[PDB]
């Protein structure tokens, strides 16, 4: 709950980023998914440490643009 | 040494591992069926034993969920 | 030595009153007699020779030699014997338990021709008892310091909870002590660990003790655990605990050793605190019935080294094959003269020379329906620890303490008037649990036990 | 939430690099399964509950509990299994090994639903290895302090210790050390008995050391037993042995405890003394296979708390498996990184983070005919203690010393040439004994040629 | 080693611990002049120097077979 | 070394979890590549050679060697790069910050071929974190000792006065503490100087603390400055301050050093006082953006060495180019696991192994109209120092304290119910400043700020 | 010194640190008998005693030009 609230409050001040407007604001799962996705992107190709965080992000998102974007990322260009 | 279902390391049968169990004297509203002279819970809304929480610890395992060596705590 | 009777197995020998006797139970390898094995156990615990090729130049012989004076078979078991051997008094240092241990059980337990070896008892002469200090205070002084006469004392360990903040720890201790208990015990795994360092725990526990004792009117305590990595760290914890004004501390006498326990007992004797000993890591030594060191030997060594309370384990759930042994070594550490009786495990007649006694602590998953039994079995001079039978009351910490207090006083007051406690335990408790809601709730949560047909 | 799950047997859980792993071999009562017994061992040695009715007071647990994660069975034996358990790092305090012992092997051995339980190995993370002091000196530092390179060291135990006055004790020590030995050892159960007090013995032993040192030209030593009844007396004996100028002392870490051994190790580091650890009273704990604590666990705990030498017992006459086991933990006392090889008893991979080594000591009345075997099994990083193999020579003590010395250096030289020690051991010993009377007398006395297949 | 039914007793010396010197056979004098010449025939036995006994090698004088203390091997 | 890739710049190397990583920002001289400058920074921080002519006789090399495993360019700036290099664990002493500093930044900052060098971050492994002690108490214990839950704490330095007697000093401290503040801080230039020696100051401050705390009912404090010329003088001041019963002391960790700060932190841990660290003389090291040691490195080194409060500076008047960095570093010293994120300046993922946190102190010319912002930027685990916003109230010292207390409680009470603190700061304060003349007067002179369009 | 585009690398040894001995030219034997006569032709090179290399003077063996540690000058 603490990390969820912190991610929700951190979301607004990332106005410019990679794929920011594909995660909506009025859903908590998508805020948390954006946190995980941005934390994973701060890495290089898999190394089994980026894929873990992408799979964590996919297990909590609840929109559809979030889902097809994270699928574009984790599985196939 | 209660064992739930088939023999195991005595997961206590009285609760089947729940540790907590439903309290005996509250039905639905955590109400007290019992009426007693003290009257604190006699009137109705609050169950005397669990004070409305609707569960207690299991008496056989004391909430541990298993017996064997650790009947204790 | 040869067909000549080994000069170590001398059955016509009767021991002096200044000899340390020891009784081993051994089981030998196939194809080895019993007498040879007895004499070999006698020769391993001392000079490791049967002959005189080393140990005779001018007179250095027959003075530091462990004769073996009795061998008999165990009843029931086959290929299993008792060997009684007897050591002189000049082999042992004055005031050291380490030396006695490393001289008896030093390297005999690795003898190859023996299949298994157990040390069942031991007898210290009075001449050796009087060079040790003994318990700091004892039973009568320990009862007079706290001003608790008649009844046994109550305590409540806080074991299930883990990771507690120091302040919530102090809070739970306060709620227990205020409700009507006497002592309260730290978990024995709790030392200074990153979630709860020791000085904060000591501070908040001391504050709780002062508050509850001031607003109740009697003397309360809490066994603070001063087990440490070094002699310096341990003495530092103990000094700080005395500064706050604490009556009693705690220690682990098997993982920390006997040197540290002797040092701490001398400090406690100088500074006037009581010492509570916690037997941890003991089943590693005395669980199997065919190898190790039975526990009554360690109880004697602790009465010698130092300690006022000692964990001895309950007997409510055992048969008379082991209830007998536990009652035996509970008498071995309270009285002053114990006569030899093999049904209760006592092998030798031991006289303690007016050294004080220790106090047995009965613990581990007990609740109110056991209080009738424990009261008579262990007697007035015992401490009763309630792990879960207190903290789990349906509505709090203080009510659980009140319930246990009420039950105890009911049982003891009833025993004073001649009523039986085997026939009339349940109805005593039920008659008492009528003018008090706490005891009623407690009786309803747990379940009656019905010891046996009508007694024991 | 129901316990059919057991929430403690997590077979897919992989353990972190900051978890302390433990491997038990247990055998359960008739009628109890194996995985339940593994979960029960994990719960007994932690918060003793499977449920969450206490710990979940305010959403805070599942980080102070151990969890079983592998319960393979034992080959050959039936009704006995292995159980691996992983404990978090924030359960133990730093610098304290009594806490580790109390937290793992506390009350678990008293569990009622298992017949027998033994603790076979343990793995300390580097995060935890790095907070202990370790050996005071190590191996390199002590070879440099004593100035002895390229061969084992030689020691003798004094067997007619009882009823021997302090001055005759000193004279025997002088005779042995003058012949060519390096260390003499004080018997384990000689502290302060009324026939021979300790100050009166430290005096004459120091005198003999000083005399022989100069004449031999070698740095000599005698392990002086400082095991005392209290912390105070122990410290007094150690301070006096330092004032005299002694380079090495002795202790018993299983009768005196771990608190006293850690205190003594810190003193010895601060004051430049070496420490030799004697392992009395060990078969009480680790002889029978069914129950106890295997000795390699205590060797690891010793390397952590402190110690420079350690008794380990000969390996010449063990059959196999029981022999390859011993060699196993010798490598857990000298090597810094040890890979998992279950054939030699090592269960987990252990990395020591550049902490010094410990020196094995082989003891047990060995004689000269054993010199080849030992010299090639333990290598050159060890001490060889001789009992009757030195004091029983027909001529005296100094001849026995020179006999053992000659045999050892002969074996070492041939090994340098590449002659196989085991194959040519009888031959190597025979040729050396030709130009030396002492070695010839010894060869004959100890008729045991000890055939080598 | 050992005598068998009573395993511990040494078989080479039968418990004597000491034994007759095997070089001079208990005579105390050298049978032959040594090659080195330090020891000469009819003077003193080289090994025992006239005492006519030594310690038995098997038990190293203990009279014990397999004792943990003394000749443990 | 040569066209051979230098044996120090190994881009295919991935570091182990027991390596200390360091990230430098460097700018090289004209006519020098980037890879060679990276490898040279790697060789200067360790054995100062590329070859093996000294450091190879038998084995002793290729271990105590700082490989450089990454180099990249900085975005925006030209001729400016980031170099990530990684040191082994065997180079560093166990428990010493001095050694880590003098081994990393020892003599690389004077390399000639580099035009400028900055140390931006650092990553300690867990194996090294666990050999230091850390803060004496932390956040939770420090909150439990004082019994202040929910809100952030208030304090008021007495800065502009200098040359006051000791008694008037005690008087002002009393007026401030009685009115409703919690702490009070000494000017950091105040040591024993001829107009005001230290023992007199300590005496009168202690008397004021006792009076106000007795007649108010909660726990008050005052950061006494124990910075001294020597280890002896400093320990003497600290012992006397403990004797009077003071909860908290103060120190300067950059002019006094790290040896004195470690010594004082161990004393505070033994004796149970809290330590407040004051960062003075820091802009000498970390102001210019092209040379020096950024401040987050020193914040980490202080969390390791010891200290419970630390000055971090406000963020009310910065842009998101530096507000980000300050928030990033603030999280680096409160939490227990921080993930790599370059927008907030965190370069590496740092895990703190359940070591406690420190507490950020926000100070320097702030007044009531800032209270809405601070309360929701720092959260409620922080301390707020009011230099002039308290002592300058139109009619005294105690009314100013009362005004600040009222404003703080209004803002926090409002925050919990869900009301925004960016849209509704001003009207919250105005609605609260209606039943209290003090807050009305304080709102009068101090002016509203109007952060931005409507938020941030 | 240095090679120029990459300034740090030593220009005299090209990073070798060691170099061929300039006295015997890597031969390891003295070209001429010395005036002192301690060193003789065809025996051992006086400077390197047969090792056939020395440290490069410019970098003193470091392979570093201008390093603060080593050859700072």
Curated annotation (Swiss-Prot), chain A:
<comment type="subunit">
    <text>Homodimer.</text>
</comment>
<protein>
    <recommendedName>
        <fullName>Rubisco accumulation factor 1.2, chloroplastic</fullName>
    </recommendedName>
</protein>
<comment type="function">
    <text>Required for assembly or stability of RuBisCO. Acts at a postchaperonin step to fold and/or assemble the large subunit (rbcL) into RuBisCO. RAF1 brackets an rbcL dimer (rbcL(2)), leading to rbcL(8)-RAF1(4) complex formation. In the next step, RBCS displaces RAF1, thus resulting in holoenzyme formation.</text>
</comment>
<comment type="similarity">
    <text>Belongs to the RAF family.</text>
</comment>
Curated annotation (Swiss-Prot), chain D:
<keyword id="KW-0503">Monooxygenase</keyword>
<dbReference type="InterPro" id="IPR036422">
    <property type="entry name" value="RuBisCO_lsu_N_sf"/>
</dbReference>
<keyword id="KW-1282">Carboxysome</keyword>
<keyword id="KW-0456">Lyase</keyword>
<dbReference type="GO" id="GO:0009853">
    <property type="term" value="P:photorespiration"/>
</dbReference>
<dbReference type="InterPro" id="IPR017443">
    <property type="entry name" value="RuBisCO_lsu_fd_N"/>
</dbReference>
<feature type="short sequence motif" description="Interacts with RbcX2">
    <location>
        <begin position="448"/>
        <end position="453"/>
    </location>
</feature>
<keyword id="KW-0479">Metal-binding</keyword>
<dbReference type="Pfam" id="PF02788">
    <property type="entry name" value="RuBisCO_large_N"/>
</dbReference>
<dbReference type="GO" id="GO:0031470">
    <property type="term" value="C:carboxysome"/>
</dbReference>
<dbReference type="GO" id="GO:0016984">
    <property type="term" value="F:ribulose-bisphosphate carboxylase activity"/>
</dbReference>
<dbReference type="InterPro" id="IPR000685">
    <property type="entry name" value="RuBisCO_lsu_C"/>
</dbReference>
<keyword id="KW-0120">Carbon dioxide fixation</keyword>
<keyword id="KW-0560">Oxidoreductase</keyword>
<feature type="binding site">
    <location>
        <position position="311"/>
    </location>
    <ligand>
        <name>substrate</name>
    </ligand>
</feature>
Swiss-Prot record, chains E, G:
<keyword id="KW-0143">Chaperone</keyword>
<feature type="binding site">
    <location>
        <position position="59"/>
    </location>
    <ligand>
        <name>Zn(2+) 1</name>
    </ligand>
</feature>
<feature type="binding site">
    <location>
        <position position="10"/>
    </location>
    <ligand>
        <name>Zn(2+) 1</name>
    </ligand>
</feature>
<feature type="binding site">
    <location>
        <position position="24"/>
    </location>
    <ligand>
        <name>Zn(2+) 2</name>
    </ligand>
</feature>
<feature type="binding site">
    <location>
        <position position="16"/>
    </location>
    <ligand>
        <name>Zn(2+) 3</name>
    </ligand>
</feature>
<feature type="binding site">
    <location>
        <position position="53"/>
    </location>
    <ligand>
        <name>Zn(2+) 3</name>
    </ligand>
</feature>
<feature type="binding site">
    <location>
        <position position="56"/>
    </location>
    <ligand>
        <name>Zn(2+) 1</name>
    </ligand>
</feature>
<feature type="binding site">
    <location>
        <position position="18"/>
    </location>
    <ligand>
        <name>Zn(2+) 3</name>
    </ligand>
</feature>
<feature type="binding site">
    <location>
        <position position="21"/>
    </location>
    <ligand>
        <name>Zn(2+) 2</name>
    </ligand>
</feature>
<keyword id="KW-0863">Zinc-finger</keyword>
<dbReference type="GO" id="GO:0005829">
    <property type="term" value="C:cytosol"/>
</dbReference>
<comment type="function">
    <text>Chloroplast chaperone required for RuBisCo biogenesis and translational regulation of the RuBisCo large subunit (RbcL). Stabilizes an end-state assembly intermediate of eight RbcL subunits until the small subunits (RBCSs) become available to produce a complete stable RuBisCo complex containing eight small and eight large subunits.</text>
</comment>
<feature type="binding site">
    <location>
        <position position="13"/>
    </location>
    <ligand>
        <name>Zn(2+) 1</name>
    </ligand>
</feature>
<dbReference type="GO" id="GO:0110102">
    <property type="term" value="P:ribulose bisphosphate carboxylase complex assembly"/>
</dbReference>
<keyword id="KW-0677">Repeat</keyword>
């Amino acid at each position: 709950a603490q990390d969820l609230a912190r991610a929700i409050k951190d979301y607004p001040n990332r106005r410019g980023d990679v794929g920011w407007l594909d995660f909506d604001y009025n859903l908590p799962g998508d805020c948390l998914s954006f946190l995980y996705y941005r934390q994973s992107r701060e890495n290089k190709n898999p190394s089994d440490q980026r894929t873990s965080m992408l799979l964590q992000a996919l297990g909590v998102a609840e929109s559809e643009k979030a889902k097809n974007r994270l699928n574009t990322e984790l599985y196939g260009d | 040494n209660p064992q739930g279902t088939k023999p195991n390391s005595l997961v206590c049968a009285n609760c089947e591992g729940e540790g907590c169990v439903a309290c005996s004297q509250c039905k639905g509203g955590g109400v007290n069926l019992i009426d007693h002279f003290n009257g604190q819970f006699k009137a109705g809304a609050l169950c005397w034993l669990c004070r409305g929480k609707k569960e207690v610890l299991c008496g056989d395992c004391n909430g541990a969920g298993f017996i064997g060596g650790f009947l204790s705590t | 030595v040869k067909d000549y009777k080994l000069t170590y197995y001398t059955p016509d020998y009767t021991p002096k009153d200044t000899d340390l006797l020891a009784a081993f139970r051994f089981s030998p390898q196939p194809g080895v007699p019993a007498d040879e094995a007895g004499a070999a156990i006698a020769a391993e615990s001392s000079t490791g020779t049967w002959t005189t090729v080393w140990t005779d130049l001018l007179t250095d012989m027959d003075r530091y030699k462990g004769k073996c004076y009795h061998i008999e078979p165990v009843q029931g078991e086959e290929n299993s014997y008792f060997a009684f051997i007897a050591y002189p008094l000049d082999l042992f240092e004055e005031g050291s338990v380490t030396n006695i241990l490393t001289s008896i059980v030093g390297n005999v337990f690795g003898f190859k021709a023996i299949r298994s070896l157990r040390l069942e008892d031991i007898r210290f002469p009075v001449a050796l008892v009087k060079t040790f200090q003994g318990p700091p205070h004892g039973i009568q002084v320990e009862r007079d310091l706290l001003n608790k006469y008649g009844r046994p004392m109550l305590g409540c360990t806080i074991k299930p909870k883990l990771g507690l903040s120091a302040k919530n720890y102090g809070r739970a201790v306060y709620e227990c002590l205020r409700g009507g208990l006497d002592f309260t015990k730290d978990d024995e795994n709790i030392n200074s660990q990153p979630f709860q360092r020791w000085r904060d725990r000591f501070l908040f526990v001391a504050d709780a003790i002062h508050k509850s004792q001031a607003e109740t009117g009697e003397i309360k305590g809490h066994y603070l655990n001063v087990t440490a990595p070094t002699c310096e760290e341990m003495m530092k914890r103990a000094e700080f605990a005395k500064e706050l004004g604490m009556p009693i501390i705690m220690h682990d006498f098997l993982t920390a050793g006997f040197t540290a326990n002797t040092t701490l007992a001398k400090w406690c004797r100088d500074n006037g605190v009581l010492l509570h000993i916690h037997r941890a890591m003991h089943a590693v030594i005395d669980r199997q019935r065919n190898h190790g060191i039975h526990f009554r030997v360690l109880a004697k060594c602790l009465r010698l080294s130092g300690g006022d309370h000692l964990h001895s384990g309950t007997v409510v759930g055992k048969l008379e094959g082991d209830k007998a042994s536990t009652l035996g070594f509970v008498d071995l550490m309270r009285e002053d003269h114990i006569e030899a009786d093999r049904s209760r495990g006592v092998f030798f007649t031991q006289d303690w020379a007016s050294m004080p006694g220790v106090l047995p602590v009965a613990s581990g998953g007990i609740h109110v329906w056991h209080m009738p039994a424990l009261v008579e079995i262990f007697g007035d001079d015992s401490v009763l620890q309630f792990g879960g039978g207190t903290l789990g009351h349906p509505w709090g910490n203080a009510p659980g303490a009140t319930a246990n207090r009420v039950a105890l006083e009911a049982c003891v007051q009833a025993r004073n008037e001649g009523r039986d406690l085997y026939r009339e335990g349940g109805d005593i408790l039920r008659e008492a649990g009528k003018w008090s809601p706490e005891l009623a709730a407690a009786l309803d949560l747990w379940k009656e036990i019905k010891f046996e047909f009508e007694t024991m």
